[PDB]
Every structure is written in C-alpha cells, then in structure tokens.
Design an enzyme around this catalytic site. Structure first.
Site, PDB file in Angstrom:
ATOM      1  N   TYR A   1      -9.472   3.831   1.315  1.00 33.13           N
ATOM      2  CA  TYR A   1     -11.028   4.764   1.390  1.00 33.13           C
ATOM      3  C   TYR A   1     -11.751   5.034   1.403  1.00 33.13           C
ATOM      4  O   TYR A   1     -12.225   6.024   1.431  1.00 33.13           O
ATOM      5  CB  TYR A   1     -11.459   3.028   0.287  1.00 33.13           C
ATOM      6  CG  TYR A   1      -9.840   2.734  -0.818  1.00 33.13           C
ATOM      7  CD1 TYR A   1      -9.470   3.000  -1.825  1.00 33.13           C
ATOM      8  CD2 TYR A   1      -9.473   1.146  -0.488  1.00 33.13           C
ATOM      9  CE1 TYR A   1      -8.933   2.781  -2.552  1.00 33.13           C
ATOM     10  CE2 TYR A   1      -9.219   0.209  -1.613  1.00 33.13           C
ATOM     11  CZ  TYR A   1      -8.941   1.619  -2.255  1.00 33.13           C
ATOM     12  OH  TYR A   1      -7.698   0.742  -3.680  1.00 33.13           O
TER      13      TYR A   1
ATOM     14  N   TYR B   1       0.830  -1.374   0.270  1.00 34.31           N
ATOM     15  CA  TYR B   1       0.553  -0.121   0.661  1.00 34.31           C
ATOM     16  C   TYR B   1       0.808   1.166   0.144  1.00 34.31           C
ATOM     17  O   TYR B   1       2.481   0.968   0.431  1.00 34.31           O
ATOM     18  CB  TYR B   1      -0.841  -0.036   0.894  1.00 34.31           C
ATOM     19  CG  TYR B   1      -2.099   0.539   0.854  1.00 34.31           C
ATOM     20  CD1 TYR B   1      -2.733   0.030   0.151  1.00 34.31           C
ATOM     21  CD2 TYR B   1      -2.768   1.592   1.583  1.00 34.31           C
ATOM     22  CE1 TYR B   1      -4.527   0.413   0.330  1.00 34.31           C
ATOM     23  CE2 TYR B   1      -3.858   2.762   0.661  1.00 34.31           C
ATOM     24  CZ  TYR B   1      -4.530   1.967   0.692  1.00 34.31           C
ATOM     25  OH  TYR B   1      -5.758   2.468   0.329  1.00 34.31           O
TER      26      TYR B   1
ATOM     27  N   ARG C   1      -1.622  -6.544  -6.474  1.00 32.70           N
ATOM     28  CA  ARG C   1      -1.865  -7.299  -5.766  1.00 32.70           C
ATOM     29  C   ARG C   1      -3.299  -8.599  -6.225  1.00 32.70           C
ATOM     30  O   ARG C   1      -3.709  -9.368  -5.693  1.00 32.70           O
ATOM     31  CB  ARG C   1      -3.358  -7.054  -3.767  1.00 32.70           C
ATOM     32  CG  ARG C   1      -2.635  -5.796  -2.802  1.00 32.70           C
ATOM     33  CD  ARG C   1      -3.613  -4.704  -3.066  1.00 32.70           C
ATOM     34  NE  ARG C   1      -2.830  -4.332  -1.416  1.00 32.70           N
ATOM     35  CZ  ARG C   1      -3.563  -3.860  -0.331  1.00 32.70           C
ATOM     36  NH1 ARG C   1      -5.097  -3.824  -0.369  1.00 32.70           N
ATOM     37  NH2 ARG C   1      -2.873  -2.761   0.641  1.00 32.70           N
TER      38      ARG C   1
ATOM     39  N   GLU D   1      -3.400  -1.649  -5.602  1.00 35.22           N
ATOM     40  CA  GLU D   1      -4.310  -3.496  -5.788  1.00 35.22           C
ATOM     41  C   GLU D   1      -4.460  -3.749  -7.355  1.00 35.22           C
ATOM     42  O   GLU D   1      -4.477  -4.839  -7.174  1.00 35.22           O
ATOM     43  CB  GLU D   1      -5.849  -2.677  -6.070  1.00 35.22           C
ATOM     44  CG  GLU D   1      -6.546  -1.163  -4.813  1.00 35.22           C
ATOM     45  CD  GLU D   1      -6.860  -2.429  -3.733  1.00 35.22           C
ATOM     46  OE1 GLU D   1      -5.965  -3.374  -3.168  1.00 35.22           O
ATOM     47  OE2 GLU D   1      -6.974  -1.230  -2.866  1.00 35.22           O
TER      48      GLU D   1
END
Ligand SMILES: O=C(O)c1ccc(Cc2cccs2)cc1
Length: 260
Positions: free
Chosen positions: A121, A78, A178, A175
């Site tokens: 988020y 992240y 990931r 993301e």
C-alpha cells in the site's frame, strides 16, 4: 490440473449475497491446504508448497463485460499480478523464489511485464497520489477499477489510475477474504449502493494483518505476549489482550512460526 482454480465475480447486478458467495468461494480456495485445526485458519506455509497449489485466480467482470483475472498467492491471500487480454502484469517480487513462482502464471500470454514496484500500500498510494483514506470503495469503484485494469493493456489507462485501481481490488478481495470485518464493511457499501473510503478501523486492520497473525500464532494459550493496538471508526486507539475478540474479525492468517 493444467490450470489453477478460478473464482468468477461480476459487478453487473452485484448484490450483498453475490459478493458474499464470492468472498466465501475465494476463502474456500485459499484454505484448501490451510491448517484449520485451531480457532483461526492458517494459510499454507510458503516453504515447501508445491507450485501447482501456490495460486488462485480471480476473474472479474463488469457492466461493460470487460474481464481481468487477478492472481492471488495462497500463502498470504495477496494479489501478485493480473491478466488483461494477451498481456500479464506482475508486481516486483522480493526474492528469486517468488520470481520463479510467477513464471507459472498466465503461461498462455504473449506479453509478460514485471513492474518495478511491489504491491504494498505504501508504494501504491505513492503511485496513485492518493492515500487509502481518500480512495472510495464499493461496487462502483470496483467496476471502474476493472475497466481501468483492462485498458492498461491497450494504452488507455495511466499508471496512477492503475495503482488506485489495484488499491480498490486488493481491499475488496484480498482484505475482505482476510477479514470478516472488512467483508462486512463492503456488504454495507453494496447494500446502500454507496461508495466511500475506508475509515481508520479498516485501515489499521489492513496494516496490522501480519502483526496479528504473529501475536495469535505466538500466543500463550490464546493470550498475547504484548497487546496489539487497533483503531475504532472514529480514530481512537484501543488494544487487544487475547484472540477471543479477533476470531470473528480475522478469517485467515499468514503462516507464522511459534516459540521454543
Ligand atoms: O467502536 C467502533 O467504532 C469500532 C470498534 C472496534 C472495531 C474493530 C473491531 C470490530 C469488532 C471487533 S474489533 C471497529 C470499530
């Protein structure tokens, strides 16, 4: 080696192939210290990780040839902060150890700032005044996010736009690293030169990353204690019993423990 590893990417003339190599390279650097013994890579444990292996840098550039560099935490992939020019900006760390860790980033810079807010988020959507489902992703949005992040350091970008830009960058980089499924969703957007907000399949995967990392690492021979629920493109719920179907979808997992 003095500096953390740097992956470069530019939206200028970006193709499906160039984005693909970019995400490939990011995963590579994220998994230098990963546990790749099982079906899905597990990112290094936060606990005991030497500081010189803790972060990677992602340098983004666009048609305007503005440049910003994001710092990603190898333990969860992240974004923890970024650099534009002679300033660096960090999300509010959750604990004292994380706060010490980020003092090792961008040591070169004159101006260091820690936002009051974290980078989750829920909070970023609040600051942006926009849910993920109404924030478009694609090369165009990423190009604009890069400019906005750069011009935050000159007083040219307002915070809601900054937050919206983070939401774009995190989804297209973190993301996508990931999740092969999310990387693929970005490839399609890049191919057809389109910009569009993520459907519920992308959003629930993003929301489920920690839970999936947990269910997988705590599974009995790859079968789950209790099923995890995801959504299709059309919003309909389905559930997943075992890791089989997730091996092609999730590329990296956060370190999780396992039972007695
Ligand atoms: O049918 C669909 O639209 C759909 C189904 C599952 C997903 C999430 C996955 C894709 C591949 C394995 S699980 C996304 C979209």
């Amino acid at each position: 080696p003095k500096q953390y590893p740097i992956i470069n990417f530019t939206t200028a003339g970006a193709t499906v192939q160039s984005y693909t190599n970019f995400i490939r390279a990011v995963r590579g650097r994220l998994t230098t210290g990963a546990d790749v013994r099982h079906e899905i890579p597990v990112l290094p444990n936060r606990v005991g990780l030497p500081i010189n292996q803790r972060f990677i840098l992602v340098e983004l550039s666009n048609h305007a040839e503005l440049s910003v560099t994001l710092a990603l935490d190898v333990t969860n992939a992240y974004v923890v902060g970024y650099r534009a020019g002679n300033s660096a900006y960090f999300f509010h760390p959750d604990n004292q150890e994380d706060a010490e860790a980020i003092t090792h980033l961008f040591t070169d810079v004159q101006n260091r700032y820690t936002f009051a807010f974290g980078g989750n988020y829920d909070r970023l959507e609040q600051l942006a005044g926009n849910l993920r489902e109404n924030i478009e992703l694609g090369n165009g949005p990423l190009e604009e996010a890069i400019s906005a992040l750069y011009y935050y350091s000159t007083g040219g970008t307002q915070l809601p736009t900054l937050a919206r830009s983070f939401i774009i960058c995190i989804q297209m980089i973190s993301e996508a690293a990931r999740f092969q499924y999310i990387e693929g969703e970005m490839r399609t957007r890049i191919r057809y030169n389109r910009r569009s907000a993520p459907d519920p399949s992308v959003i629930t995967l993003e929301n489920s990353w920690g839970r999936l990392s947990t269910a997988i690492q705590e599974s009995n021979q790859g079968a789950f204690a209790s099923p995890i629920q995801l959504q299709r493109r059309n919003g309909s719920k389905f559930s997943v019993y075992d890791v089989s179907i997730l091996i092609p979808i999730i590329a990296l997992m956060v370190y999780r423990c396992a039972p007695p």
